[PDB]
From a paper:
Thus, in the deep-sea bacterium [name] D25, TMA is taken into the cells through a [name] [name] and then oxidized to TMAO, resulting in the accumulation of intracellular TMAO to millimolar levels to function as a piezolyte. [name] is a member of the betaine-choline-carnitine transporter family, and we show that [name] is an Na+/TMA symporter, which possessed high specificity and binding affinity toward TMA. [name] forms a homotrimer structure in solution. Each [name] monomer has 12 transmembrane helices, and the TMA transport channel is formed by a four-helix bundle.
To elucidate the mechanism of [name] importing TMA, we employed the cryo-EM single-particle technique to determine the [name] structure. [name] assembles a homotrimer in solution, similar to other reported structures of BCCT carriers. The overall structure of [name] consists of three regions: the extracellular, intracellular, and transmembrane regions, with the overall transmembrane width of approximately 33 Å. The structures of the three [name] monomers are nearly identical (with the root mean square deviation [RMSD] of 0.2–0.4 Å), with each monomer forms a cylindrical structure consisting of 12 transmembrane helices (TM1–TM12). Most of the transmembrane helices are connected by short loops, with the exception for TM7 and TM8, which are linked by a long helix (H7). TM3 and TM8 consist of both inner membrane portions (TM3i and TM8i) and outer membrane portions (TM3e and TM8e), making them discontinuous transmembrane helices. In the [name] trimer structure, the loop Thr304-Gly313 from one monomer inserts into an adjacent monomer and resembles a gate latch and bolt pattern. In addition, hydrogen bond interactions are formed with the residues Glu290, Asn291, Thr308, and Tyr309 in the interface between two adjacent monomers, suggesting a relatively stable trimer composition. Comparison of the [name] and [name]-TMA LCI structures revealed that the side chain of Met105 occupies the TMA-binding site when TMA is not bounded, suggesting an important role of Met105 in TMA recognition. However, they diverge in substrate recognition, as the side chain of Met105 in [name] occupies the substrate-binding pockets during substrate binding, a characteristic not observed in the structures of BetP and CaiT.
Author numbering:
A (entry chain A), B (entry chain C), C (entry chain B): 10 to 506
Write the structure that this text describes.
Amino acid sequence: NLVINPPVFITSILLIVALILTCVLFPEKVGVWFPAAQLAVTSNFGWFFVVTVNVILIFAIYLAFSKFGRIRLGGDDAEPEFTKASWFAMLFSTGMGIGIMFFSIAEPVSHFFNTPRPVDTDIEAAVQAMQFTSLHWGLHAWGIYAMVGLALAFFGFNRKLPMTFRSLFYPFWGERIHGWWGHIIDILSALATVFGLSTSLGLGVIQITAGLEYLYGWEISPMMQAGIILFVIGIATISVFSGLDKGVKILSNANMYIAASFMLLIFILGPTLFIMKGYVENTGAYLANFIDISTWNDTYLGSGWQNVWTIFYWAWWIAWSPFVGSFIARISKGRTVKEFVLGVLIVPGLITLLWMNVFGGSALHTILSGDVTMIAAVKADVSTALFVFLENFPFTKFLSIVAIILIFSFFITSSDSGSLVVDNITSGSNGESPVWQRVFWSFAQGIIAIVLLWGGGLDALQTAVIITGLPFAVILLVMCYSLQKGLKEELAKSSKK
Amino acid sequence: NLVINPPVFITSILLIVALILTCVLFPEKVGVWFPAAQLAVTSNFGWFFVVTVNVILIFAIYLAFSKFGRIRLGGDDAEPEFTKASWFAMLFSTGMGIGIMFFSIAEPVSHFFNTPRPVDTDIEAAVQAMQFTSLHWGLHAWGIYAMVGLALAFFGFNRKLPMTFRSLFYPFWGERIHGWWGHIIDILSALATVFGLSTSLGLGVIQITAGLEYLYGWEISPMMQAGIILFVIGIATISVFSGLDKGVKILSNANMYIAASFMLLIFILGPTLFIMKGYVENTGAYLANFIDISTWNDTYLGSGWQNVWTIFYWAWWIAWSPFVGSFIARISKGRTVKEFVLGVLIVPGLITLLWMNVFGGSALHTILSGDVTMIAAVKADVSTALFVFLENFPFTKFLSIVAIILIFSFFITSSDSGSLVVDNITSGSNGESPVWQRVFWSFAQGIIAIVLLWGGGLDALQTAVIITGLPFAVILLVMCYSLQKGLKEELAKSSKK
Amino acid sequence: NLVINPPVFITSILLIVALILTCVLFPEKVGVWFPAAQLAVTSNFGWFFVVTVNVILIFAIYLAFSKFGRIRLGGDDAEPEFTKASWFAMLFSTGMGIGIMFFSIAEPVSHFFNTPRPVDTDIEAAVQAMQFTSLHWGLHAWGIYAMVGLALAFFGFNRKLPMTFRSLFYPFWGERIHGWWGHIIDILSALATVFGLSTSLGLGVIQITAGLEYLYGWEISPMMQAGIILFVIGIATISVFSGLDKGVKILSNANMYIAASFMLLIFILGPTLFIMKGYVENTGAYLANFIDISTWNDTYLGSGWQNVWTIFYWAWWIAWSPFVGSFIARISKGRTVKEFVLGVLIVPGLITLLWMNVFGGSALHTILSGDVTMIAAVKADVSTALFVFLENFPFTKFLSIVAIILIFSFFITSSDSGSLVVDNITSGSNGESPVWQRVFWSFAQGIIAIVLLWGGGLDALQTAVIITGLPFAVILLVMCYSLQKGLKEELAKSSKK
C-alpha cells in the first residue's frame, strides 16, 4: 500500500513542492533568480563539468581496454538474454528520443550563424557546427551513460543489491550508505533524474506545439499546453493501471523502427552522396580534433557561448544519467565489461552521429546552397527548426505529422520509463511498489515540466538541470572512483581458484 | 600444351579482347564514355574508397597489436629465409617503383599551385602539398599491401592452399570457391592486377619518352612509343627464354642500390639540412593530422580535386594489390604476423616518405625561393617534372640519364614480375605453367598499356584503375573481414596443446 | 685524501681550466667564437635534438606500457622507502625550479610579442605561447629525466654497479667501459652536468640581481655579482663542512612548501576561474597538437626562433639530465618500471604545467586586458619579468622578497645537490670521497658560472649548454638503446622459474 523509503520519499516530495511553490507564487523573484543562478554556476564550474565528462569518458575507455574488461556482468555462469543486434537496437532506443528530435537541426544551424569560435568562411562555420554537435552528442554523453550503466549493472547483478545510487558507494563506505549518508545521494539522484525527465518532457511539449502552430496556424496558449501534458500523462496512467500490454518494449521497438524509417526517408529524399561524404568527413574531423574541442573552455575569448550549449549538455547528461543507465543495465546481463562498455560507447554513439549528419548536415547543405531560410526561423524560435527543414522535402505534411507522432510516442515512452526508475529509487526494492506511486511520480514530473515551462520555457529547464547536475557531477566522479575499487575487489576475489 | 584454368583464362582473355576491340573500333565513343564513367564512379564512391582504405589500415594495425600478431607465418616450426635487414631492404622495392619516380616531384608541386584545400600563404601551401603527398604514399598504400600480403602468406603457407585470391575466401565460403563462385574472384583479381600493372607500364613509358624529348629534343610519335613498349617486352621475354639465369632478384638488388644512390645524390647535392628538417617536420605533421586528411572527403566544397589525386591513388593501391601482396608474401615466411605487419607498414612507408621528401620537398624549396620554373613546366605536362627538377643540379645530363635507366630497369622488373602473378592466378598451381603463357601475358599487358595510351594517355589508365578497383575495393573489404575469421580459426586450433 | 679517477678528474679539471683561460684571457676572440659556434651547432642539429627528445619520450612511454614495466627496481624483494605522495612531492623538487622561476613569465610573454609561428589575432598568439611553453616544460623534459633516472636506478640497484654513466653502457661494452672508452663517457657527463648546474646558477644570480635592482634601485656591477656568487657558494660549503648533513632534504621540503604557497597565493590573488579554465584548455591543446609542435622544425620559414628557445631547451635538458636523473633514481627504490615512469613523466609534468598556467597565463590575461606593460619590460630585459608581474598584485614587495628568497634557497639546494653528482661521477665510489673535493667542485661550478656571466650573460650559458649537450644527445640516444637490451636481459633472467 505504502511501501516507501521515508527519508528519501518525503524529502524529495517536500523539495519538489517547495520548488513548485517558489516558482508559482514568487513569479518575478523566481524569474530573476533562476537565470542569474544558472549563469553563476555555469560560469564558475564549466571547467569542472568539462573535466568531469572527460574523466568519465577516459575512465570508460580504460575499463573497456584493461583487465577489468574481462569481468562478465551477472557472474561467470550467466548468458545474455538478447543477441548483439537486439542489444544494440535497445541501446540506441535508450538514447535519444526527444533531445535528438529537438536539437538535430536547431543545434547545427545555431552553431552556423552563432559560431562557438570565430571563423571567416561559411564552409569552416559549417564544419565547426557539425564538429560541435558531434561533440555534444557523440561520445561524452554515451561515456557518462556507459559508466552509470556499468556501475548499476555491476552492483545490481554481481553484488545482488538494488540498482539505485545507494549501492554504488558500497566499496568505500561499507554499511554507512544505509543511514542518512546514502539517503542524501538517493535524494540527489531522484531529483536529478526527475529534472532530466521533466526537461525531456518540456522539450517534447515545445516542439509539438511549434509543429502544430506551423502546420495548422493554431493560436496556442499555455493552457492547452498544460492540457496536452495532462492528457498525455493520463494516457500513460491508463496504460499503467489497466495495462493493455508491456507498453515499453513494444513501443520502444515501434519508436526505433519509425525513427529508422524517418532517417532513411531523409537520407533518400534529401542529399544522399553529400550525407555519406559529410558523415565520413565529419566523424573523421571530430575524432581528429577530439582533445582540442573536448577540453576547450573558451577562456581567452570569454564569449559565454558554452554557458548555454556545451556546459548545459554536460550537466544534462550527468543529471539524467541515472534514468539512461538504469535501462542500459537492465538489458545488459551476461556481457563482459569490455564488450558492454564498447557497445554502449561506439554503436549508439555512431548512430547518433549518423542521425546528426542526416539532419543537420542536410540543413547545412541547404544553407550553403544559398537557401537561407532555416537561419531566420531558428533565430526566431528554435522549436520550428525541424518543421522548417521539412518544408523543402517531398511529403512535407506527412513527414511533419510523422515527426509529431514520433515525438508524442517518445513522450509516452519517456514518461512511462523514467517513472519506474524514480519509483525504484524512491521506494527501494525492485518494483514491488504499487502502481499508484508510479502514477503519482509521473504526475509530479508532468507538473514540474508544466511549471518550468510557464516560468521561462527553454530558460528554466536548463537552469534546474545545471543546478542539480553540478553536485551530481561530483557524485559521478566519486561513483567512478568507487566503481574502480569495487571492480578491483571483485576481480581479486574471482582470481582465487 | 597449356596448363590453364578454363573459366578464368578464357574469361580474362575475352574481356581484355573486348575492351581492346571497343577502344580500337570506337575511338570517339570510348573517349567520351571512359572519362564520364570514371568521373561518375569516383564522385559516387570516393567516400567508399576512403572508408575502405581507412578500415584496411585500422585492420592491419589491429592485427599487428593483438593476440593474432603472435601467429608465425608458415607454422611454428619455420624460420625466415632472409635476415631482417635484407627483408626490409627488398620490401620497399616490392611495389610502387615506377609511380614513385613519376610522382616524386609532379605530385607535391601539383598540390602547390592546385591546392587540395584553400590556403593563403605559400608556406602553408607547401606544407599541405607535402602532407597530402605523404597521405597518398605513406601508410594507407602500405596498409593495403600489408593486409593483402598477410592474407596471401597465411593462406599459402599456414593453410597450404594455392596463393591466389580464390583461397582467401575459403573460411566463409567452404568448398564453394572452387566452382563458378571463386572463379569470379580470380577473374576480377587478374583484371585488376593487369590493369594496375599496365598503369605502371604507361607511367614508365610516358616518363621515359618525356625524358628523351627533354634531353635530346626528339619528336616521338605514338608509333615510337609502341616500338619502345615492344622493345622492352622483347627484352623481358628474352630474359625469360629459359632462364636466364632468373635475372630478377639480381635486378631487384641493382634497382634498390641505384635508387638509394640516386636518393643520396639528390640529398647531398641539393639541400641537406632543409631536407632533413623538412622530413622530420612533415612526418610529424602527417602523423598529427592523420585522421583529418585520411577521412577528408571534400564534401563542403566539391572542388573535384579528389577525383584525380586521392580517390585515384586509393583505387590504384587496391587494384594492383594482388601483385604487390604476392611478392610481399613470397619473401615473408617464418615471420610472425605482428613483425610482418609492422615491417610492411613502417619501414617501407618511412623510406617512401624519405624519398618523397628528398625529391618533392627539395623541389618546393626551389619553388619557395622565387624560382618558379617547375610550376610552369608541370602545368604544361607532368611527365617532365623530374627532368626539369634535375636541371638546377650538378651533372644534370648524367642524373637524367641514370633516372631514365632506373625507370627502364623498373619497367623490366615490373613486367617480369607481374607476369608471374597473372600467370599463377590464371593457371592455378604454384608455377607449373609453361614459359609461353608468361610471354603471352606480358604481351597482353604491353598491348593493353599501348591501347590505353593511344586512348587518352594519362586519362585512361586512371579510368580503368578506378573502374576495376571499386569492386576490388569491395572484395578487399570482404577478404579483410574473412582473414580475421580464418586466422582466429588457426589460432584456436593451435592453442589446443 | 685524494680518492679520484685520474683519467676523469684530470681531464675534466684540465678542460674546465682551459675553457676558463680561453674565456678570461681571450675576451674579444671568444665573444665572437662562442655565439657563432652555438648558432652553427643549433642550426645544423636542431632536427637531431628534436628527434632525440621525441625518441626518448616515446621510449619512456613504451617502457612504461610494455612487459618491461613489470620489472621492480632493486629486485623483487624490495619495498619503496617512501609512500607514493611523499615520492611524488619530491620528484618535482629535484629540478627544475630555478629555470621555473625564470621562464614562468618571461617565456610565455616572449612567445607573445615574438611568436614562434605567424598568427593574426592576439588570442591565437596567447594560445600559441602557452602551447610552446607547455611543450618546452611539459613532457619532453620529464621524458628525458625519467629515462636517465630509470637507467641509473636499474644499473645501480638491479646490477649493484656505481650510479654513474660508466655502468649505463655495460650491456654491449662489457668490461671495456672500465678503461679509456667509458672514461670519455664519464668526462662528457661530468662536463655536461657541470655546465647545466652553472647555467642554473647563472639564471638564479641574474634573477636575484634583477630583483634587487627593481626593488631597491641599486646599481650592481659584475663585481658585486661575483661577490654574491661567492657568498652563496661560501654558505653552501659552510653548511657542508660545519652545519651538515640532512638539511638538504629539510631545505628541499621547505622549498617545495614555499613554492606551493607562492603558487597558491598567485592563484588566489590573481585570476582564479581564468587560471583553471586556461589550465584545462591549454593542457588539452598541448595534448591535441602534441605531434605537431614536438616535431616542428621551422624548416619552411627559417625564422631562427628555435635556435634560442626550443633547441636550447632540449640541449639544456639533455645536458643536465645526469644531475636530475641521479636524484630521481636515489628517491626511487622498490618501485616498478611502469609506476616509476608514469610517476616521473605525468605528475611532475602536470605540476610544471600548472605552475606555467598560474604564472604565465595570468600574465597573458593581464596583457590581453589592454595592460601591455610586461611586454615592454621583457623586451628591455627578461630577468625582471617576474618582478614586473608581481607589481600588479597585492603585497608586491612581500611577494617579491619571497620570490628572491625562494630563488636563493633553490640556488643553495641546486649547488649542494649537483656537487654530489659531480663528485660521485668524477671520483667514482658511492660517497666515500672527502668533503674538500665536494666543496672544490662547488667552487669550480661557481667560478664557471661567474666566467660565463662575464662573457655575455644569457648568451654564453646557452652556448656551452648546447655545445656539450649535442654529443650528450648522442650519448643519451645510445644509452636509451642500451637500457632496453640490459633490462631485457634482466627480464629474461628473472623469467626462468
